[PDB]
Design a binder for this molecule. Structure first.
Ligand code: AMP
Ligand code: AMP
Ligand code: GLC
Ligand code: GLC
Ligand code: ADE
Ligand code: ADE
Lengths: 821, 821
């Protein structure tokens, strides 16, 4: 019987083994047909691409079935909105998550290619600044691994975080053209572009509020598959790209409309009020929500008709998690769509809105919070400002009702901030429109409830939660440290990879001679490997037997790279003072990027190199001390240096680091930690036991006691001879002969306006470091303590974090069951 | 025995049938894995892409073997440099050339998809303005079909010729974002980017001339396969894309450097002296020649070492054909590279240069010739200007030597033109640095030798050749008119497809009743099909029995769309005058684009629509006359309307149309021609016999006689009552009631400053048209005359043209032998 076109298309089947032989054929097919190459001209980069496309097929197949599965079941969809997604490399992570690594390694070997070499070819997908963006990345990995119907929505920056170059000891930013050789993992959807409006004005009419005479910029989505660990679950990361909606000049000008998604703002924990950044936030928000609603409506499998027009179930089928306030406009935008476009009444739309959105705070520092001036919002998004004002009036009335007669409270909790410039407090907006607000570490969430968000916590205590951060154990252990992962597996099996708390079992081997020996060996191995990669991809020197003292993270005054520098110089002087005394050999590495406009951070980077130039060439010091500034710190570099570290520097001022995640990676990889009772350090110390940590410095309480009286760095200066010695060297030009005054700003800040009180923790920091070097003299005890750390790092897996987000906020249950293949 | 990496990589084999079943699998694989789609969301566009990628594989496989074959044999490589490549659609052309059409049609049918529908989805690769760009396209097709190791080098404009919209009867240009949904046929080579220098200055040193302090813009090549007809020969079309070599603003500014390859200048037969256009010409030239030399050097198969460092054989291994003067900078650039970079002495470099380059002229019109002012070249390319000056001195000395004492001759032949503005005559540059200069049609090449290039012809007669244009019979017959191709094949077989002269055999059927009937039927069929496509994709009306009077080509005063308009109105008035007289029903279609800045051409487009608004709604006229302006004329539209035409309008002023190619397409497809003895019309008339053509108007000689005395349109006006009637309607506002003066410029030009003498050919044009309508009254005789045209169109195949270029200029012999598969 003649089949109709419908019956025939049923052959359009997802079909077509993870065989070494089959991998070979495909690699061969992609190299020629996809790359339009052959062995006569194929470069290592070409072979890397051939492999990427080969693995990609297996990724794509799973992806399609996963996405088809979500339409079949209609599960509550989780949308993680973020302006950053610090993904890193994808090849190895994909192979390990799909269990293709061994088969692929063999296939390439049989073709005369080295898979490790091909992997090094790949560039980082550095669409992030630091912790916040990397957290989003770990989160996607964990959500897929926990079988959640999760999505990541953000911007596809043509230029991510700048590639940092060092010349003359100074940071030199260079455009990160990460898309130069193309991105094989993404898939453009030029067919699903959506309109985003800007400017214009609002006309209030008898058939609704009309936002007219707007400027339109289109949003084109690019899809990237995100694989869960061996469960065949592949979710989606959706990033938006801006597109245009005297003839020649007009055509050349089209390109200008696309500058919205051109580059990532290089600010970390710092609010820069640029309209372009505001356009980026709205851009991602408007496109994302249109897409979310569109997917919600077309729920029937096999059918693309908008069958689900009723929003009653919207909050039970959708969850929008705001990564910081950057995507906070999602609140008034969702309201705009529902009220203005769907004709829903305000109250009912507000209920849906609040039940859909949840807000995550990542800092308590004033300069990092978003406070957009109203004149800007008014010109760029008049309708949203009108909506923001209404939300505030409704919200303020509730505040008035709960605290009658509290005049100053109305001022404090208002979404509208008066002052030199009238602004809208985005954190206040997020709290008002979210059914949940969470800190990112226990001490941080508590601080929020007691300080900046105290008034809000009193009005709606139920909203406030804590969701201690975490990192994914696939990338931050299995990928970056296979040697350690292997040594661990030999003892407890491979279950820990997807259930990190399993690591506690290692406690039973804290006295095992072989284990102790094998753990130390992996570290040594990693130390050598890094020393190698270091002196082969750059200029470097090593005595891989020296203690690797590492502090990698974005350069910030609050993170205190300067406190570390004071120690370095102090040690230098101490070695010179008593040349006939034994000093534990140490290699102090400091790496991280500074925002271009952050003058002080740049000066700090320059201090590190200036110090190195002196120390690294002092014969009296020999190789008892080496100071290095690790150039261009990024995800792929983190993956190499962290497994090679002995000491993890997590020294931010108590109360400033909301959580930190590098501290977690360090612990998971065999390094001991020296740090303050700040952010997640507190819980790490608690898990491992304080005797197995090098805790030092002021606690949050002490910092406050000092703040109420007034901090006076001079008081410590006048009583610590060693410190004065260090400061005078900086001030007199010892570390800058050519430019005696080079470090004047740094000294003047430390002495007269140090918001992070470096001098207050100096003495205790130096003493703590001595304690560190002492334990290092006892290799057996140093490693047993390491074991005690690794075995208690389970709580810091991002799966645990996500599990709580899913259960305590999203209302979805984690799953470990796998889809077929 | 353990195979080394070298022996292992031998498996990196080109491998992996044109089976309906195999096509199905692949289509299925691409739809899912390549497109990341499935039947649940797949759109017709998605299916078109699935098919494109499927065919592409078979294209790519052949391509690799073809390119590998050229390195194995080291044949003389032919480089066709052009600023335009009017390619059109690729899907059908690829399938027919690879004999995959039937198998693909069946495969799609079995999946419930219509292949014709999928093909309509594809967009034109309109990187051209008109004839010149389309010629380059036909040429690539013919070179591959004649097994020449040929290449096409140009710019990959992000925006080709604007998509023309008509609103209010006016042309409205819209950006041609042809890359919106991606281009599956191209392959980016981000790894082979080359540096292009601009500005800076020259330092003359003891180790050569150094061009320093330049601005650099990179050139990234995109490769597109070009298939020959059933010979498994797939050549390459290489187009260049520009790439970049207050932090945020700096990053946003990177994009500005890429504006060089942003848009195609919409000028046809018109020189606009913009620096950007000059940058485009140098851009394509510098990148192309670096690539040419690089390929020349690495000649050994399997080896990429530059083994061939000696240039002695360069002219026997390379040929650069300049399509017009646009790429003329190739002459001084090649000299720069050889002399400045390769350290070759001038004379020896000049010999190589002249033996490598050949120049093709496409117009004698003064405003179309490139004359770049020296201040511009001096600022943008100082070194090239220095080289241009040297070439001129050397050249002028030779002129002095050949014509001693000829003072004015030195002035005329100089590459440097004095005047209001000092410029460099690029045509003069091309002639001086080329071993061959060719016209593009017999009458044109003769005109060159007698007028603008007369002095040069006297100095070096040997250089001047003629290469009468042609069109490819695959696309312009097999693709666009399968019905006619089929009717023809039934009689003489399929050999004509690659040997057009085979069509002469059709003469034996000029009296065959069935043939006569079948030829007329195909036309009728095409007429209906076009009427359909017309009223379904736009608004249209038809009486497919009316004579289809068509004039499609770029709007120009020299092409005389206005003469056609005068006839249209004359006929309108005639029908109204004698309502009780029989008038052969006619549908006059006029289509074509006007450069944005060409005011007169735009007014002409507006006249066509203005006339239509009146004629098409006059009840007294009924459907005895319909005037239509065919919107957005382009390659894919040409492919639809030309097969449906009865009368081909080729009415340019004698001596102005260098050749024309549309005239050829029309003849090949069954339309009779009404035109002047101009360009290729002359040879067409000669081939078919003048009795089978509707020749009219002034011949070249007459135009000159009138020029020497002075043209006075008033003289014809005062003696032709019917003409005055038409002009007064235009002048008084009959065709523009709302705006009586709308056509004032057109009238004033026709009456007082008509460089193309429309009035001089009016009377004879009208009479000739009457003769046309008369023959149309006799369907049998009209078709027998058609047959006499089609059967003598063989000479106009581009294979014949290319064959002569290959043998008379390039020194390579055409081949019809096929490579294996
Ligand atoms: N209505 C549907 N029924 C079944 N699968 C669907 C449907 N809509 C989309 N999909 C699948 O889900 C993937 C992601 O689509 P989207 O959710 O629109 O981003 C598509 O590439 C299809 O494979
Ligand atoms: N040295 C060579 N020996 C054999 N084939 C080559 C060589 N160089 C290039 N090819 C082939 O020719 C194609 C075009 O290369 P190219 O000529 O550099 O544009 C490459 O994709 C290879 O398939
Ligand atoms: O929440 C993820 C991260 O966000 C920010 O980067 C905070 O500064 C950091 O402490 C936190 O770990
Ligand atoms: O040579 C190709 C074409 O070049 C130009 O477009 C000429 O105007 C045209 O007459 C010629 O056919
Ligand atoms: N990222 C940043 N941090 C601190 N101050 C800044 N001033 C400008 N950019 C800054
Ligand atoms: N293309 C063109 N032809 C004639 N005149 C023009 N003036 C500006 N552009 C022109």
């Amino acid at each position: 019987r003649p089949l109709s076109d419908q019956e025939k298309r049923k052959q359009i089947s997802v079909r077509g083994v993870e065989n070494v032989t089959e991998l070979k054929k495909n690699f061969n097919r992609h190299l020629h047909f996809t790359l339009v190459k052959d062995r006569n001209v194929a470069t290592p980069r070409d072979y890397y691409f051939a492999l990427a496309h080969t693995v990609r097929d297996h990724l794509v197949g799973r992806w399609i079935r996963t996405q088809q599965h979500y339409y079949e079941k209609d599960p509550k969809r989780i949308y993680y909105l973020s302006l950053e997604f610090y993904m890193g490399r994808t090849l190895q992570n994909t192979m390990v998550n799909l269990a293709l690594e061994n088969a692929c390694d063999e296939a390439t070997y049989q073709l005369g290619l080295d898979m490790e070499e091909l992997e090094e070819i790949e560039e980082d997908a550095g669409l992030g600044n630091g912790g916040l963006g990397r957290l989003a990345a770990c989160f996607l990995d964990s959500m897929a691994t926990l079988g959640l119907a999760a999505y990541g929505y953000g911007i596809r920056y043509e230029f991510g975080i700048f590639n940092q170059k060092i010349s003359g000891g100074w940071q030199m930013e260079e455009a990160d053209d990460w898309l130069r050789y193309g991105n094989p993992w993404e898939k453009a959807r030029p067919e699903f572009t959506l309109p985003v409006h800007f400017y214009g004005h609002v006309e209030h009419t008898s058939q609704g509020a009309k936002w007219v005479d707007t400027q339109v910029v289109l949003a084109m989505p690019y899809d990237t598959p995100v694989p869960g660990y061996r469960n065949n679950v592949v979710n989606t990361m959706r990033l938006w790209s801006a597109k245009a909606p005297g003839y020649i000049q007009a055509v050349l000008d089209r390109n200008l409309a696309e500058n919205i998604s051109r580059v990532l703002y290089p600010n970390d924990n710092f609010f820069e009020g640029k309209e372009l950044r505001l356009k980026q936030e709205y851009f991602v928000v408007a496109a994302t929500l249109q897409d979310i609603i569109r997917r919600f409506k077309s729920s029937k499998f096999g059918c693309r008709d908008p069958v689900r027009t009723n929003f009653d179930a919207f909050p039970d089928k959708v969850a929008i998690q705001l990564n910081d306030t950057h995507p906070s406009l999602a609140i008034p935008e969702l309201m705009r769509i529902l009220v203005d476009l769907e004709r829903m009444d305000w109250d009912k739309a507000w209920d849906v809105t609040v039940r859909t959105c949840a807000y995550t705070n990542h800092t308590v520092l004033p300069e990092a919070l978003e406070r957009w001036p109203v004149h800007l919002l008014e010109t760029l998004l008049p309708r949203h400002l009108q909506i923001i004002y209404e939300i505030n009036q409704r919200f303020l009335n509730r505040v008035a009702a709960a605290f009658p007669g509290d005049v100053d409270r109305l001022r404090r909790m208002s979404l509208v901030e008066e002052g030199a410039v009238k602004r809208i407090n985005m954190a206040h907006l997020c709290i008002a429109g979210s059914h949940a607000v969470n800190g990112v570490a226990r001490i941080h969430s508590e601080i929020l409830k007691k300080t900046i968000f105290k008034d809000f916590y009193e009005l709606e205590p139920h909203k406030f939660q804590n969701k201690t951060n975490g990192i994914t154990p696939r990338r931050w252990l299995v990928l970056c440290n296979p040697g350690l992962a292997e040594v661990i597996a030999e003892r407890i099996g491979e279950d820990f990879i997807s259930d990190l708390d399993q690591l506690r079992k290692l406690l039973s081997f804290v006295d095992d001679e072989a284990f102790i020996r094998d753990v130390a060996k992996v570290k040594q191995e990693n130390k050598l490997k890094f020393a190698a990669y270091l002196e082969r991809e750059y200029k470097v020197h090593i005595n891989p037997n020296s203690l690797f003292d590492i502090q990698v993270k974005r350069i910030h005054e609050y993170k205190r790279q300067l406190l570390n520098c004071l120690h370095v110089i102090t040690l230098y002087n101490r070695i010179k003072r008593e040349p006939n005394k034994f000093f534990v050999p140490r290699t102090v590495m400091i790496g991280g990027k500074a925002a271009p406009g952050y003058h002080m951070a740049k000066m700090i980077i320059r201090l590190v190199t200036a110090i190195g130039d002196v120390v690294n060439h002092d014969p009296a010091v020999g190789d008892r001390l080496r100071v290095i500034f690790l150039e261009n710190y990024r995800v792929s570099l983190a993956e190499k240096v962290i497994p090679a570290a002995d000491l993890s520097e997590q020294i931010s001022t108590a109360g400033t680091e909301a959580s930190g995640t590098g501290n977690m990676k360090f612990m998971l990889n065999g390094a001991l930690t020296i740090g303050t009772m700040d952010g997640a350090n507190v819980e790490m110390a608690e898990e491992a036991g304080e005797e197995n940590f090098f805790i030092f410095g002021m606690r949050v309480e002490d910092v406050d006691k000092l703040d109420q009286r007034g901090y006076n760095a001079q008081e410590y200066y006048d009583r610590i001879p060693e410190l004065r010695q260090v400061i005078e060297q900086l001030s007199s030009g010892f570390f800058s002969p050519k430019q005696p005054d080079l470090f004047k700003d740094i000294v003047n800040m430390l002495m007269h306006h140090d918001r992070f009180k470096v001098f207050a923790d100096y003495e205790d920091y130096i003493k703590c470091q001595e304690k560190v070097s002492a334990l290092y003299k006892n290799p057996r005890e140093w490693t047993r303590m390491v074991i005690r750390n690794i075995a208690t790092s389970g709580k810091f897996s991002s799966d645990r974090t996500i599990a709580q987000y899913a259960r305590e906020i999203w209302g979805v249950e984690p799953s470990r069951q796998r889809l077929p293949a």
